[PDB]
Each structure stands twice: as C-alpha cells, then as structure tokens.
Amino acid sequence: GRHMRTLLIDNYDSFTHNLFQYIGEATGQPPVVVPNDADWSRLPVEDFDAIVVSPGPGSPDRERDFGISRRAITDSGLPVLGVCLGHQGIAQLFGGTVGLAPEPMHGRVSEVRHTGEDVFRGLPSPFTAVRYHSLAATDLPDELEPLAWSDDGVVMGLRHREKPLWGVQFHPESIGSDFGREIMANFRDLALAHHRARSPYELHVRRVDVLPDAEEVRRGCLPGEGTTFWLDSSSVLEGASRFSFLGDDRGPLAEYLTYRVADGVVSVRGSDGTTTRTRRPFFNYLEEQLERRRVPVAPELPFEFNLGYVGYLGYELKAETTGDPAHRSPHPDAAFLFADRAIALDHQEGCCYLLALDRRGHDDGARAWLRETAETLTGLAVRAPAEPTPAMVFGAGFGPLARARHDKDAYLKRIDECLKEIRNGESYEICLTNMVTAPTEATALPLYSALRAISPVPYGALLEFPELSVLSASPERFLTIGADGGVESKPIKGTRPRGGTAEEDERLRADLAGREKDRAENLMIVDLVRNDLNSVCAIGSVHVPRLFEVETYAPVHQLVSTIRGRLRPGTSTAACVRAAFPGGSMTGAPKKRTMEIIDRLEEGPRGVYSGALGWFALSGAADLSIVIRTIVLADGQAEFGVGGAIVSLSDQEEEFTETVVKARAMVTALDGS
Amino acid sequence: RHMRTLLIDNYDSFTHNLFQYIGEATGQPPVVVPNDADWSRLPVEDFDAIVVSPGPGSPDRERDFGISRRAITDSGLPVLGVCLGHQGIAQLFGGTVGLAPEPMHGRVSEVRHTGEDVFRGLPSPFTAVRYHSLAATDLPDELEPLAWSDDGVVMGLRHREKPLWGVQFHPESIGSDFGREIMANFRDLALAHHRARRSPYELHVRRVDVLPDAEEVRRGCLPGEGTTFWLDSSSVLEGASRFSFLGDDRGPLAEYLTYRVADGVVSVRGSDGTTTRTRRPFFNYLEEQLERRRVPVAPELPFEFNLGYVGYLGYELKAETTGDPAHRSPHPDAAFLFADRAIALDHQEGCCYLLALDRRGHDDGARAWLRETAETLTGLAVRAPAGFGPLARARHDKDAYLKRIDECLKEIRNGESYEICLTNMVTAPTEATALPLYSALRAISPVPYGALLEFPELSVLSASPERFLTIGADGGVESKPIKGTRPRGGTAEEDERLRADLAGREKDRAENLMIVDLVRNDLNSVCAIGSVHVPRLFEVETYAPVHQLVSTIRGRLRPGTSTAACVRAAFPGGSMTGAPKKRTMEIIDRLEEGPRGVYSGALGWFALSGAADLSIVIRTIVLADGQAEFGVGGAIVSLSDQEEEFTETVVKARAMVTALD
Numbered sequence A: 001g002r003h004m005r006t007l008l009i010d011n012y013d014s015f016t017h018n019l020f021q022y023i024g025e026a027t028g029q030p031p032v033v034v035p036n037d038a039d040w041s042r043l044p045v046e047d048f049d050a051i052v053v054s055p056g057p058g059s060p061d062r063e064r065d066f067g068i069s070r071r072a073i074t075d076s077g078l079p080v081l082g083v084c085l086g087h088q089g090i091a092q093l094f095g096g097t098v099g100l101a102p103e104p105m106h107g108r109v110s111e112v113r114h115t116g117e118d119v120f121r122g123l124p125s126p127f128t129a130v131r132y133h134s135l136a137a138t139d140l141p142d143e144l145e146p147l148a149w150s151d152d153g154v155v156m157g158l159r160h161r162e163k164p165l166w167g168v169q170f171h172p173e174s175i176g177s178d179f180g181r182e183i184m185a186n187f188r189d190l191a192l193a194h195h196r197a198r199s200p201y202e203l204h205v206r207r208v209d210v211l212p213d214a215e216e217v218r219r220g221c222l223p224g225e226g227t228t229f230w231l232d233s234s235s236v237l238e239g240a241s242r243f244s245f246l247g248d249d250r251g252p253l254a255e256y257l258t259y260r261v262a263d264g265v266v267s268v269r270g271s272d273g274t275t276t277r278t279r280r281p282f283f284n285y286l287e288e289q290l291e292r293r294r295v296p297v298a299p300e301l302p303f304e305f306n307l308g309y310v311g312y313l314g315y316e317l318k319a320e321t322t323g324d325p326a327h328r329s330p331h332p333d334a335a336f337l338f339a340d341r342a343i344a345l346d347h348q349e350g351c352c353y354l355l356a357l358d359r360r361g362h363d364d365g366a367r368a369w370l371r372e373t374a375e376t377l378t379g380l381a382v383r384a385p386a387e388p389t390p391a392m393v394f395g396a397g398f399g400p401l402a403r404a405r406h407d408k409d410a411y412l413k414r415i416d417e418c419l420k421e422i423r424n425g426e427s428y429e430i431c432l433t434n435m436v437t438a439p440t441e442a443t444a445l446p447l448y449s450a451l452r453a454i455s456p457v458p459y460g461a462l463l464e465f466p467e468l469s470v471l472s473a474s475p476e477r478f479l480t481i482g483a484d485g486g487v488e489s490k491p492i493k494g495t496r497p498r499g500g501t502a503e504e505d506e507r508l509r510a511d512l513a514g515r516e517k518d519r520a521e522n523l524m525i526v527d528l529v530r531n532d533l534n535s536v537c538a539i540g541s542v543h544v545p546r547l548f549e550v551e552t553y554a555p556v557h558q559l560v561s562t563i564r565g566r567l568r569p570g571t572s573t574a575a576c577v578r579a580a581f582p583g584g585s586m587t588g589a590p591k592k593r594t595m596e597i598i599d600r601l602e603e604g605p606r607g608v609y610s611g612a613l614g615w616f617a618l619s620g621a622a623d624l625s626i627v628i629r630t631i632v633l634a635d636g637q638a639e640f641g642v643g644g645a646i647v648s649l650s651d652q653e654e655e656f657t658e659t660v661v662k663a664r665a666m667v668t669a670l671d672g673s
Numbered sequence B: 001r002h003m004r005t006l007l008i009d010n011y012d013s014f015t016h017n018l019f020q021y022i023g024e025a026t027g028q029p030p031v032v033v034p035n036d037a038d039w040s041r042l043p044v045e046d047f048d049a050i051v052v053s054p055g056p057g058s059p060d061r062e063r064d065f066g067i068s069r070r071a072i073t074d075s076g077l078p079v080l081g082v083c084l085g086h087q088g089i090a091q092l093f094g095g096t097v098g099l100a101p102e103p104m105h106g107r108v109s110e111v112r113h114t115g116e117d118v119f120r121g122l123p124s125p126f127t128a129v130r131y132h133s134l135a136a137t138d139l140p141d142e143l144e145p146l147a148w149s150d151d152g153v154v155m156g157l158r159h160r161e162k163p164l165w166g167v168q169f170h171p172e173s174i175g176s177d178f179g180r181e182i183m184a185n186f187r188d189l190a191l192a193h194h195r196a197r198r199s200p201y202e203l204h205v206r207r208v209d210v211l212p213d214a215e216e217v218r219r220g221c222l223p224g225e226g227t228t229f230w231l232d233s234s235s236v237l238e239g240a241s242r243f244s245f246l247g248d249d250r251g252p253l254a255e256y257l258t259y260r261v262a263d264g265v266v267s268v269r270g271s272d273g274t275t276t277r278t279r280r281p282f283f284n285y286l287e288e289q290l291e292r293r294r295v296p297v298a299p300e301l302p303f304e305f306n307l308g309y310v311g312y313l314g315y316e317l318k319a320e321t322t323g324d325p326a327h328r329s330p331h332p333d334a335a336f337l338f339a340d341r342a343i344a345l346d347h348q349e350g351c352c353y354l355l356a357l358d359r360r361g362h363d364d365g366a367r368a369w370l371r372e373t374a375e376t377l378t379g380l381a382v383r384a385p386a387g388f389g390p391l392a393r394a395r396h397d398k399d400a401y402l403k404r405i406d407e408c409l410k411e412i413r414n415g416e417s418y419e420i421c422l423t424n425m426v427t428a429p430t431e432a433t434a435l436p437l438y439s440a441l442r443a444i445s446p447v448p449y450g451a452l453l454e455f456p457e458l459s460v461l462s463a464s465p466e467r468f469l470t471i472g473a474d475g476g477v478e479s480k481p482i483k484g485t486r487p488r489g490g491t492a493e494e495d496e497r498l499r500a501d502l503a504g505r506e507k508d509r510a511e512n513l514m515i516v517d518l519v520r521n522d523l524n525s526v527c528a529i530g531s532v533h534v535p536r537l538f539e540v541e542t543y544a545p546v547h548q549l550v551s552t553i554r555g556r557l558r559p560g561t562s563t564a565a566c567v568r569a570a571f572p573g574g575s576m577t578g579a580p581k582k583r584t585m586e587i588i589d590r591l592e593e594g595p596r597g598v599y600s601g602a603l604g605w606f607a608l609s610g611a612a613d614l615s616i617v618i619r620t621i622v623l624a625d626g627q628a629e630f631g632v633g634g635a636i637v638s639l640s641d642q643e644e645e646f647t648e649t650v651v652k653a654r655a656m657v658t659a660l661d
C-alpha cells in the first residue's frame, strides 16, 4: 500500500535528532523535522499520519519554547506523541496542572511502572527511563488518564480518553533509557489503527443469556434443506477458541457466490433470484464488496464478526496470486455466503448474540428475526451431558473402498522427485499432498456430527452449499486480522500421532518439540509467512512472539509457531490474504517454484483442501483457517486431502505414513457408511 | 541526503524479510526490483548500494539470477550477495560453487568470523540459518573468506579490491542473530566506499626508521621566530595516541588564515606575502577549500593526515552554528596554517614520516625538502634519541563566580537548562616565551592532545586530554565528551578511592550523561540512521592533574555531508556548553560577560583526504602581548554545591598555574 508519514516538530532542543534516529529505526521511515517557529499555514499537515512533539526547555505556556506544537495537539486532528515538553503541553492544553515535581531530575534514571497500554505495550513494568524535567503533570483533568508513574511518584505517561493523543515525561530516546524504539513503534501502531478506524446497512444486535449445544442450534434454528454455515469451536479453550457462528441463506439480504478460475468469472446469486456474472478475479471482487459494504464494529460485542462473508477460498485461486492456473477444480475455486443474519455463541460467558442487517433506509423485518430466534434459542437450552473425547492412535490404509489418487508406490516416487528438486536447490521444503476419494451415502450433518465428536478443534466448520459440503476439523489458524489492522498467523508444520498410552503421549509430544527436522520444517515456513506479511505490513511490525509450540488434539500433536504483523495504510484485509495465499504451511518455500513442482507432481487440483475457510467481517476483520483434516462431500463421494513436508532429511516411507496418520479422523468418520 | 539501496528480488520467499531488516537497520526501505528488469532503463547510478537477494537454482542460470549478475560484474557499486548472491560472487570471479558436505535448509549453524566488514561488532560464534546445498570451495586470490561454519563451510567472503561482500547464511531469517547489525555494517561499507571516490596537488612522502626527541625536533628543524605548529602526543598510550606533527610557513604553497566573526571575513596570507580577504562564513569557506584541494589518502601512511589545515576554532564561531554574536574575541576566531610540508612522528613504531606538496605539473622542491629535512633528523636522532597564582587575575573573583553559579541554579530550577558549563577566564602577566613554557607544561601534564601553536597574534599551549571529533576519510566519526572531574590522590590508595568515587557518583554520571545525549543529537543531524551509538559509557581516564569521566560516541556521515559540516553541527562541543545547547549558550553569554576565544573551542587538523582530528581546548594557555590567558570551568546542575563547583575550577588550573611559576 504505502508507508506512514511522521512529522517531528523541533522545539529547538538538543535531543530532537535522537528521536529522529529512533523513529527511523523503529518505523523504517525517517521523520520530517520542522522547527516549532515554522508557519502552520504553509506547512502541509495533510500529508502526515502522525506527529511527535519533541522535548524542549521552558514550558508550553509560551509562544517560544513550544510554538506550533500547540496546533498539532488542538487542531491537526492527528495522532500526536508529546515527549517531555510535549507531554506537559498535552496537559495544559486540556486544562492540567503542570507544576514543580518533588525533585527536579536531569539526566537521571527512574523506574517506571505502567499499565502496558498503547505506547507501553510489550514493555515490562517496571522499566528504566531518563528524566529531564523540573516541571511535572499533577492534577489531571477528566479528559486525560495517566498510564505510568515514576518510583518518585510522578506521572510518566498519559493519554486522551477520546482523541489519539499520548504523552511521556521521560525520554525514550535517551541513552540511559530502555525500550525507546519499542515506544516509538507502539505509537506508530496506534496511528496505523487510528487511521484504519476512518455504511449502507443498519446492524441490529441482540443478546440472549442462554447457551444451547451448538449442534442443537444447528438442528434447531437452521434447516436441512438449504445453504447453511456452521463455524464450530468444537474445542473451547480460553485464549485459543471461544465462539461459534451459524446462519442460512433464507434472509432477504443474503447472497451466495462462486468463482471459477478456468472461466475467470464470479457467479453470484442475489436474494432476488438474480444471478449476475462478472469476469473478475475473486480477491478483487471481494475487496470492493468489503469496502462498499463496510460497517463499524459494535462495541457491546466481544468479537469483531459483525456479519459479512463466510465460506472458503480454494487452492487454485493461486492462479490469481503468485501461482499458475495448472489444474481445474471439480468444485468452486471460491464460494461464500453473504450472511445478513447470524447466530453467535459465546462459549466463555454462556450467552448468545443474534446479528441481522437491515438496509439503512428500509426495514426488511430483521428486528423480527431477532426476537423470534431469541425465543427459539431459549427453548433449546438444556443440560449438555459432559462427554469427554478420546484420543486416537496409529498402527494401515485409507478406508475399505477409498481410492487415493497416488497409491503408496506412486507417492514414494513423487517423494523421491521432491528429494531431487531439493538437491538441485529448487525448493527447501515441498508440501506434497495426496487426495483420497471414498463413496458415502451419508449426508453432511450426521457425518459432521461424527467428525466433530472424533476430533474437536478450534477451527471446525460445516458448510452446506449447493455444489458441495465442506466438513472441516481444521486446528490451524491461517490469518486472524483485527479491524484495527493487526494480523496473526499460526503456521502448523511438524506433525506427530497421539500416544497409545499417556506416557508415550508426552514422549511424542516432547520428541516433536525437540527434533531438528521438525523445527526446521516449521522455521522455513515461519520465514516464508513473515515474508508474505512483510509484503503488506508496516516495517518493524512483523515479529514472532512464539516459536515451536506443541498443540495437542484428539487425532494428533502439532508443532505451531505464531507470527504477527500490522497492516500498512491502504492495504485492505483482502489484499493481505491475497499476499499470503496459498498459505506457506501448505505450499513450502520458495513458494512460487515450490507450487510449480506441486503442479507437475500432483497432476491435478487440491480444490478446497489446502485453501482457507472462515469469515470476512464488514468491520474489516477476518478469521481464516487452513483447510486440512477436511472432508469435501459431493455427488455421493467423500474427498479429503492429506499432506506432509518433504525436506532434505525426509524418509520416503515415514512421510507416506504421516499422510495416513492425518487421514485417521476423516477415515474414522466415514466408517459405517 | 539518505543512502539509497537497491534490493534485487530473485523470485524468492525471503526478499520482503530483507526489506524489513534494511528498513529497520538503515532507517530507509530499499527499492525492490525483480531480477528480470532491464539494465539500461534501470538507473543504477541513482543508487549507492545493492543487496542481491537469495533464490532457488544456481547463479549460473539466467532463470534464477538474471540482472543480479550485472550488478556484481558491471555496476561498480557496493554489493551484498545473500546466499545465492554469495554463491554468485564466488563463481563470477572464477571460484567454485560445489556441493556442501550436508545440505542445510532452515537449519542453524554457529558462524565464526574475523570481525571484519559485514561482521564488525558481532560475537564469534553467532547463530545463523542456512538454506543451501551448494557452497564456495576454492576461492580465487581476488576473494577472501571472512566467516566459517561449525562444519567447516564458508559463511562469508569479500573481494579484496572491489567492494563486494557475500554471506552464505540468511541474516534476515528468524533463527539467525545479528541480522540487522550485518545490514548496517553493509550500509557503512557502502557509505565509506563512496566517500573514497569523492586534483591540484601532488603529495610526496618519505619514511625514516629513526625517532628523535619530539621537543628537540621543534628546536632543531623548526625555527623559534617563524609561525609553526606542534601537535604533541606528550602521552603515548597504545591505540589511544600514537603520532605527533610539526611544520612551519616556510613553504612555497603554505598559507596563514584568520577569520573574524565581527567582519565575517576570511583573511588568507600566502608565502608571496600579499593577503586575500574574502567575505564568507568560515565553515562554508573551509568546506569549499577542502572540496577543491581534495587529495587521496596515501595508503603507506598509518595516519590519515595527508597534510592540510592545522589550527583552532575559537568559541565565538558559535555565531555561525547555533549561537549568538554576543562578544568579540581579543584573538582571531579561527587561525589555520595551511601546511604544505610536515614532519610526523610515529611513537609506536619509532620512525618519522615527511610529507610535502608539489603543485600538479610543477616542482616546488618537495623532494628536495624531503631529503634536506630527513637528513637533519638522523643527526639529531643519535644526539638526542627518544589558587590561580600570585599575579593572576580572574575575570570573576570567587564572590562574583559564586553569584554566577546561583544564576545557573535559578535557570536550571526554571528549566531553561538541564546543565550549564560555566567558565572563568584567568589572565596573568608573564615573562616567559612560548616554547620554554610549553616545555614545562607538557612535562607537567602529558596528554594525547597537547599542542603548541605559535601564530603572530597568539601562541596556544594546550594540555587537552579531550577528544572532540575524530572523523575518518571513510566518514566514520568519534567523539569522547569529558564531563566529571576529580583531583588526584596523595597516594595510590587515594587515587583508587577517587577513581571509584567518580565512576559511581550519581551527580557525575548525570553530568556526563546529558552531554552524551547532546552529542548523540549533534552527530545524528549529520549521520546515517542507525549509525550513531555509544561503545563506552562512563569510562574513567587518569591524567597527571585529574581523573576524568569519559564517554565514547560514534556515527557515520550521511552521503554528501562534508567533514566541515559535521564539525559545524557539533560546535561548540556540548562538553563545554551543556544542554540544551542553544538556550544554555545564551545563558553563558549573559553571565560570562565576555569571550572565551580559544578556550572551549577545538584544536587540531583537517586533512585533504577528508579526515580530521579535533581536541577540545581545555588545560590551555594563550600567549598574546606578554600575557597568559587560561580558562577553567565545570558543569552546573541542580545538585551542584556553589562552593564545591568553584574549587573544581581551581583544581583544573593547577597544571597551567604550575607551568607559569
């Protein structure tokens, strides 16, 4: 998109250029330094996204000393960080008491304890910071809340309750201080969010203080006949998962859209009956709709899904990112429901939220669907009998009449082809996959009922669509994008089966976290995902809070790493996904050439498998999972992909077995016709 | 301006990771360009550096490498090959790209290195991630390996002549350490290279493997009557002070040069006799002359001073920096001898270097002078091998000075200043001439930055320990602000007490700290983003009169920033003013009630190569009209005791007060 402009007002002080350095290093762009006696009229504040008001002698109660800093705070309407004289400036300009502190403190350290909010995010409490002031903010007004204090018992941080203003008495940039660059990066982040915060719909919200069983909500509130979505936290775990979302295509503002890579056409079905056909690329279409149909996030909600698109992005959409249209999927290459009406379960607090759109102007009785569905939900609330889920094992095949595309022998060959390509330095890691087909007369909901019981996960889902049903028991987070523009990705790479005992379970759990091979498989994907995000994130923002964590589910142990970043200004949430699609964890590195190797060897499409599935909110947030451990149901057969990382140290036979281990949950669900 | 880096993408999934690290390290994001661009249409001459990204395949195939190839061979720019780039530099210069003993993909290695170029400041070992089956085996003589892996593979190389660097690891990888450091080193190596490319003179040089007594050289070779210079390392500690420099104005091409702030007039007097008075701001003029009189650094010299201007910068020149023209100096505000001929002592290796300038396509007896002068030495080398005083009148007496300190404390309480370097100025009638008194002074106080300027309007007799600015030709800057003083102890046990005391005192550390920040600020206005840093902090150095708390700061000049501009942006030294400098200097103006002149200025040399070495002017005696003027002072802060800070100034004068008696 672009980088962010930062203005740095100099109050003819002898520290301004230190702030210049720290802003430069933290944000990856140098600030524009202007003197405080500069002409505001002439100054093009239009072309700036943040201001920093430098330290300086004297007080802000003066035209000299402070000057044009005053305008930045009152008028500009922009994110501002006051430092020392600026911090003091914020106080008096909103009616604050800037008086003599107990002890003047020049070129001297204080321990600073703080909330950890805004400009103090990430910082430990306390930390060390150099002070340069006799004056100090004392009695704060009602508009300003303090964030940090000195050991001296003095205000070291503050902000405005409404406006995007921030202050520090201490000097981040001073050589005696710690976490200067962090603070400057925090302020960058705040400004990015602020700017991202700047509707043809009217969103009605309704809370119900009952929590039925999610399966009871699916069966009770939604129909078997019709297009339905169920985003299912079959596993609920504080921090990891909390919510479930359900809806259908019966509303008056709902739509259903497919895409074909081969045609290159967006087919969409209005609530009218109308069936439009554009010749677009899907990510382009999606970006536009999301921009046009924007809606702000409702504050009462504990989540940022305020309706929008729910569905899946197929692997073959790589054709319109960085890949080639090599193979043509049987199923849609994209497929979503525009959800105008949705039921949202909060497993943590034990309540429901109903959400429905009206057009800004006209009614469309969406408030009717609130009060009706509320009374339905109350009638479905009963004691769910606690039923612990058993872990699974290894010891074989892909099911009785299940035909793998590549049989074992064929796969062991393609593993060897992968191994050749790595020697010749064409890829470092190849995520080669198979595709198993198997007949089943089973309908989606009974079969999903079985799957979710076998393998409860944070990112399960049942999509019942006209062309196909997608029965996902995915544990994998692809992209979680805040409306504020924060991004998280948690690539899974590093698989291990569950232990037959509880001991051997810890043994495999520990082996997976310790092995060089698996850590390497994981690391290479971390770097690849950091790359994808760095393409559309702000410089400094991309980082890795956690590396080589082991998560455990009924079917398997997984090695997971967490990557985070913050979107650049102008970068839409859909741009961010296009940048990262397909996910590194399903392709390998380097992506482009790896995906070419995949095209030759797999000799056919992955379809929905390998893609992403989840939601894009009108708030601009998204939550997407990697499609793995997923059964695609269509035309009387069940299709499911399984894969694995092929690396220098891979063993043909062991890798083949890994694909089977992964098929277990799907294979067990299908068992019993 | 800021340095512009080109990153050549080789369709690899780590290019935007390099983008990130360059952005954070250099403070400026690279312009990314795919490997299949067009060399001509591409304006390579706009950029200052190239980072060649990794990739799949080989540097051989065009598929994989493309325009990167031409970046190394043709561009003539600084280049950093990362992985495939590193593999390309090996091969392009006739080296071998062969199979490594084990393919290493996303796997760490302990890298051990020499600490050179892209590895500067990094520990050995450090951890780095690898992504390659192939590795450099046979390096040409053109190429030189800098780093090695724990399995004995080449991890880093350079070209000996051209400014190429390769690393066979991924600094940008999450599993690697010191990635950002490496990208900064490359930025620094790129800045340096361009400053080496930026003539009216020929430079002749002659070494002589004998070392006479520094003082005797001054007596013998230089005259007592002329206008000479003597940059004197009266203290010679290894890696801290090594050289001494002497000359005179008995050259064809030599010039004396003076400036007055009042007039705004540069006054140059050639050896012809006739002067040439120009109305121009000094630093501008000095910058301009050093541009036109550029002379490449001689490589057989261990020092960078390849002749140039030797002299001082008076305090009052602040009027052209960030200060006001409040007071006229009795003395010239700048006084520089353009040295076309110089003797240079190397105290470490025990030899002399003679330097002399002939005009290009002319002969002015340089080589004739080198033999004459070098011969003279050899003979002398065997003969001689290696309170304020009685009639002294301070500007402010004690009572007055105490009341001026009070004013400082009041301005500090108001918050007009965080620290004020208040100074007094003692004058005293004396009988002695220049060389006899300096002889006493240098013996009393051996220091690294001693100096004896013997100019017409004044003699300067410095016993400065302090460094102000040491700028390289490569554009690297150092500054060691002294702030925090202590007397010596009577015995050896007393010295330890005081050494420890000075180190630990919160008051002193704060005094020093505020200057560190101030100097960082000044350097940052002229230096590359990320380049400014503080290797040492609150180091204590011991000299015959005092123990001094010293902190070291470094940086890199931006492209198109003259060494003169750097001196301008740092002048006067925060050491001698306090922060914030502008406001503090106005306070100083009001209270001191007169000029510092030479005192608290800078003294040293500006080389034709673009180097410089400037001391702060303290522990110094000016001579003019049979009168010895010396300045003393110290930092005033909120914690300052009036009576104590006065005593500090008397202690600081002991060397000067001793030398006169």
Ligand SMILES: N[C@@H](Cc1c[nH]c2ccccc12)C(=O)O
Residues within 6 Å of the ligand: A231, A232, A233, A240, A241, A242, A243, A244, A245, A458, A459, A460, A461, A613, A614, A615, A623, A624, A625
């Ligand atoms: N687990 C998510 C919601 C969710 C469940 N299944 C999903 C599938 C795709 C996307 C999101 C989801 C939460 O707790 O917030």
Ligand SMILES: N[C@@H](Cc1c[nH]c2ccccc12)C(=O)O
Residues within 6 Å of the ligand: B231, B232, B233, B240, B241, B242, B243, B244, B303, B448, B449, B450, B451, B603, B604, B605, B613, B614, B615
């Ligand atoms: N000690 C310096 C030279 C030097 C001695 N006295 C000086 C006075 C001013 C400037 C430089 C000097 C060196 O080692 O190179």
Ligand SMILES: [Mg+2]
Residues within 6 Å of the ligand: A174, A175, A176, A177, A178
């Ligand atoms: Mg620090």
Ligand SMILES: [Mg+2]
Residues within 6 Å of the ligand: A521, A644, A645, A646, A655, A658
């Ligand atoms: Mg594997």
